[PDB]
Design a protein around this nucleic acid. Structure first.
Ligand code: JHN
Ligand code: MN
Ligand code: MN
Ligand code: NA
Lengths: 482, 192, 484, 192
DNA sequence: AGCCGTAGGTACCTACGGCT
DNA sequence: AGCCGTAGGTACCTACGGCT
């Protein structure tokens, strides 16, 4: 029984918790926009080959796999993270393709994980693209029995595209989602001008773009947020006033602010009416449907001023709501308040490293494969002598050594020759070896060209981003009103 | 009921209530439905067998209460068809054998406590597609199109022909005497 | 688009559908392997993922997720709890699962959450699964048509009677007590030598149930009625003794309890009796159970009370004595049937004969196929230069295949094996290696044909394999059977 | 507490109470323990931070009540060390960072409401092995041998040295003012 | 206030048959 | 009675920060 000072214990135990929540729970990485749980989910989908072209996989299997190999926490944490990623009212660019009940804007939960099924969305392929081409550093998992990515290649700017919210210890984060076309345009601008200003970047990125559409009021909160990392953004419902017959009117709401629960908002209005804290409302209906989209109707009493009632609803209910921007992300493993340009700069630097590393990997592998095919070509060129050498050998070892001696072959080449099946000696097979070799030589010189010229490498980054923009870029949903 | 997601119309003639197994099924059902004429009451799995339970237990059961409240007709002697809040009560259990069981349990309740509801032709059985463990496995649109959409759906309307035979059937299948149920199974089962 | 559905028709068809499904595919074990679907799917999943005793423990969540996705379209709680019981040495006389972590207790504590626990097969489970890939048992489609699953396991020991079964179905239930594996295999052996053996003679091998929890059984008449008819009441009694505790005082010490009794609940019942003054003479009640001590429940008796009288009262008034109501219903040819001890052993032995016959037939097909391939390899190596030149002069596989077949009298399968041969198979000692394997195979083929030609030889092979399992896994009787 | 699995002995001098995270840990703990001298109270994960909560809410919290009831000393002004039912209160949270957090939450409660208990040296910290997510991952015997067995275990006795410093520590780490906690983290964090 | 989203943690309804 | 064991089903405590 050794003594433990209470002060020492509190400081060390608390710091341990605090740091863990900061670097490995609640805050996203600047490079891929992900927290650990999300990263491990997508990695798990990748490692089990759960791509968009394959059938949906059972949620329970995905969850069980991720929990055992990568994420030593409760199954509810894992499943709920995966659910949100599949919700088109939560993610501006959904990362998971879900089948079955995945919850609603009314705060209904997903179905039990045994019922639902999931795979990657097409855009998630771009998060994971080239993960096996030594583009990112792998690390040991929590128990030393697996490997997991420290970060994803992230071939589109996911932190800003999908945003992030997280409560840590000593700090929190709140990053709004953005339009992917605007973001990539901004990256492209930055790639041509390291010294570009926030104001110029805002010529590409007008402001946040919520999956739920709606309105933002003014640009000054956006501008403060982009300049400093912090700012208040006023969001409004999309609401119109229209006639309903007999001289009567109604307010019709077709889009609601980001992260507002629709059913809760309605109950709040019902409450205000019931407690006579708002005048002029005669009916309240949620007419939302799959076929008609979001539609909330507020009937106004004949001859009441419907505009006055609407302004009251903005004052008194979540029909108007603020987004407090607080852009904290992990930069070089540390939490940091960042502005819009810093976010884009870290992202672009990650892309350069990914594409360079991918190029270097592709080159090593092409040269290895060219070496092997040079061995097979030698064997085909002298097949009779090859056969003789092997037949006169009592063991594989002796055959290997004799092949290396007689033909000046490496160990790898000799083993490739001994592993070659007799069917490889047909006319079409022989031609296939030659053709692959010729293609590889061209490929190798293409790769060397890239690594020889930084400008060519950078241009390749631009071109790949441009391709993603053209395939996945979409229209702005949220209207920014002056 | 808190669980009851009611429809907007207040005209029983055109309103329908769907009974589903729980919130996994209820979620798809709520999203896919036509909320003007279609109400949803999610249950919670296997419901009380009223043929084996005494009245006190029946009237204390939450799911039974929610169904009585939602229907608005009262029960037994106090049943009043005119106070029906819906002219279609649609049983929509999952498409597995357990869904079938729940359907027998629901029909037992309607028969013993709300028989005029059946006589009036107000009780229906939905016909969701096979191959899904639960409705919560289906997308909302697929459940709407195949099962809830009046344009394409196929409902079975429950019909009572012979009340004496029905009495004996409920008693035999659902009652406390095991032996008759055992005899029924032996007489009717067609095995491997 | 509304058709009418008669309520009577609906009730009868829906209910029958449910009832039959629970009977044949949920609550009742198969007579052949002693398993219900959920248990069979668990063990099969362990097998398919190579979760054998020699490998490290696997996460429970992964096992459950896998079994639920591929084979068992029901709740995760059903699957996990089934797997947990299989790992409990107070539930299974021969545990089928080897668990690491909190797997519950005799006090009715549940296992830890599935994220914490880990599992693999026990050694004895290997015997359930032995020869499953040698066409011994029929595979069937899974629930959605994307997988295959076994209809029954080979079950190289008599698992129904060894581990027992309890299940509540519809229209019926089952309650089969566990048995000593040495006793059971002895009984099978006796039966295999005398189809006309009586129950009484079988009982010379199988004395009665043998519970994982040990304890006592009172009398043989309930056992005998159960074994004769499939039904009987068997009185189980705790192992209890009376001992001194100092100053002239005594206590009752209980070290084994009846099968399926919850110890904490039994204790509460005794406490209640005392509290409500329904039993005289008890001054204290403590559970002193520990990992080191084993089960130990202490009942202190009042100075000068008769401790034997108190103990008899306790047997009468609490679960300290409890009845096991035997009701041996199992699926026979896919139908529920009440069976006696002999019928259970007969169905089991017939399954073993089919398994070993089918395994022998499979081994023979495979040996003949392999002999055929080696005949082709012999030819290729004996004529290697001509083989190579035939292939080299061929533009495609098809041409090479056809030319090899005409020139060297090779089958399609032989030609394909030759084209699949790696150059390393042309080393100098390979030709001798083929010749050796071929000679051994012809001998093996002959051995297999001998077995299939003589039913007595087949049967003796079954006896020998059973005997081997008995010698490796057989253990001492735990439950003591005392005369009434 | 209902949860409390008490020991046989009624002599506080030799009795110990182990506080564990929940029933997953509780099960292994109950099986491995020496029930003569070792009591177990399973909690339910993260406990109330008493430094941030209002007194009424503290005294209404089930886990807080169970601990007070089990200890028998009362709290605050009514604290009576002589009425202690155990002379060792042993914190045995899981060996993960969240176990560490729960430990800080427990210590906060003891310090603010039962400070004499700490001064008397009655508060200890168990040291379970590090590789396991939760005690429920361990076999009973391994938990006994490594963590609970007085012959081999290594308990840390909690000692209060400077009460002014302790006051400031609890206030800074556990109190409602975020900025000082943030400043602490920045000043002390050692990142990769 | 009390909500947002990753985290630590747990408790009861129902059917079904037999005991007796 | 209420328990045995496979099935259908579900709800609420806690920490943490910043906004209202
Ligand atoms: O502990 C409690 C206490 C009260 C309570 N009330 C309602 C409720 O729903 N629950 C309550 N609870 C708990 C929870 C029920 N529990 C059942 C098991 C389920 N498990 C889902 C699951 C997990 C895994 C699966 C599949 N399904 O596959 C492998 C990976 C792990 C989670 C919810
Ligand atoms: Mn269901
Ligand atoms: Mn824990
Ligand atoms: Na008794």
């Amino acid at each position: 029984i050794n003594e433990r000072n209470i002060t020492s214990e509190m400081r060390e135990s608390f710091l341990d918790y605090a740091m863990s929540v900061i670097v490995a729970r609640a805050l996203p990485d600047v490079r891929d926009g992900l927290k650990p749980v999300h990263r491990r989910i997508l990695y798990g989908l990748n490692e089990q080959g759960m791509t968009p072209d394959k059938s949906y996989k059972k949620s329970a299997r995905i969850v069980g796999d991720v929990m055992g190999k990568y994420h030593p926490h409760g199954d509810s944490s894992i499943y709920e993270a995966m659910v949100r990623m599949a919700q088109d009212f939560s993610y501006r660019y959904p990362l998971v393709d879900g089948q079955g009940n995945f919850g609603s804007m009314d705060g209904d939960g997903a179905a039990a994980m045994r019922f639902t099924e999931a795979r990657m969305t097409k855009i998630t392929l771009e998060l994971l693209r080239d993960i096996n081409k030594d583009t990112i550093d792998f690390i040991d998992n929590y128990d030393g029995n697996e490997r997991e990515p420290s970060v994803l290649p992230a071939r589109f700017p996911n932190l800003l595209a999908n945003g992030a919210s997280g409560i840590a210890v000593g700090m929190a984060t709140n990053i709004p989602p953005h339009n992917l076309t605007e973001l990539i345009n901004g990256v492209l601008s930055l790639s041509k001008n390291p010294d570009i200003s926030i104001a110029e970047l805002m010529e590409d990125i007008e402001g946040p773009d919520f999956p739920t559409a709606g309105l933002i009021l003014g640009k000054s909160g956006i501008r403060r947020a982009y300049e400093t990392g912090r700012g208040s953004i006023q969001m409004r419902s999309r609401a119109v006033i229209e006639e309903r017959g007999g001289g009567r009117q109604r307010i019709v709401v077709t889009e609601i602010p980001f992260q507002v629960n629709k059913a809760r908002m309605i109950e709040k209005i019902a409450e205000l009416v019931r407690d006579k804290k708002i005048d002029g409302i005669t009916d309240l209906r949620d007419e939302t449907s799959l076929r008609t989209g979001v539609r909330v109707v507020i009937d106004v009493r004949k001859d009441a001023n419907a505009s006055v009632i609407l302004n009251n609803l903005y004052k008194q209910t979540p029909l108007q709501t603020s987004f407090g921007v607080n852009m904290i992300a992990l930069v070089n493993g540390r939490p940091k308040l960042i502005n819009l340009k810093e976010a884009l700069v870290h992202y672009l630097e990650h892309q350069k490293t990914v594409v360079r590393r991918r190029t270097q990997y592709n080159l090593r592998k092409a040269k290895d494969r060219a070496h092997i095919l040079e061995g097979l070509r030698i064997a085909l060129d002298h097949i009779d002598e090859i056969i003789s050498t092997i037949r006169e050998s009592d063991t594989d070892k002796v055959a290997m050594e004799s092949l290396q001696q007689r033909f000046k072959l490496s160990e790898k080449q000799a083993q490739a020759i001994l592993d070659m099946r007799l069917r490889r000696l047909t006319g079409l097979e022989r031609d296939k070896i030659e053709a692959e070799y010729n293609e590889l030589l061209n490929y190798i010189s293409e790769l060397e060209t890239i690594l020889a010229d930084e400008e060519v490498l950078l241009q390749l980054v631009r071109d790949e981003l441009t391709e993603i923009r053209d395939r996945f870029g979409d229209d702005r949903r949220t209207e920014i009103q002056l | 009921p808190g669980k009851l997601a009611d429809c907007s119309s207040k005209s029983p003639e055109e309103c329908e209530i769907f009974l589903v197994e729980g919130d996994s099924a209820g979620g798809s059902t709520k999203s896919g439905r036509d909320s003007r004429t279609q109400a949803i009451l999610p249950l919670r799995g296997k419901i009380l067998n009223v043929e084996k339970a005494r009245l006190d237990r029946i009237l204390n059961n939450n799911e039974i209460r929610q169904m009585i409240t939602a229907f608005g007709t009262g029960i037994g002697g106090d049943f009043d068809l005119a106070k029906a809040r819906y002219h279609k009560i649609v049983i929509m259990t999952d498409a597995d054998v357990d869904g079938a069981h729940i359907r027998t349990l629901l029909l037992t309740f309607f028969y013993r406590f709300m028989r005029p509801l059946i006589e009036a032709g107000y009780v229906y059985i939905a016909q969701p597609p096979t191959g899904y463990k639960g409705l919560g496995e289906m997308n909302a649109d697929q459940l709407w199109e195949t099962t809830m959409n009046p344009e394409h759906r196929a409902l079975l309307q429950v019909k009572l022909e012979d009340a004496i035979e029905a009495d004996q059937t409920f008693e035999m299948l659902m009652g406390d005497v095991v032996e008759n149920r055992r005899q029924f199974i032996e007489d009717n089962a067609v095995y491997a």
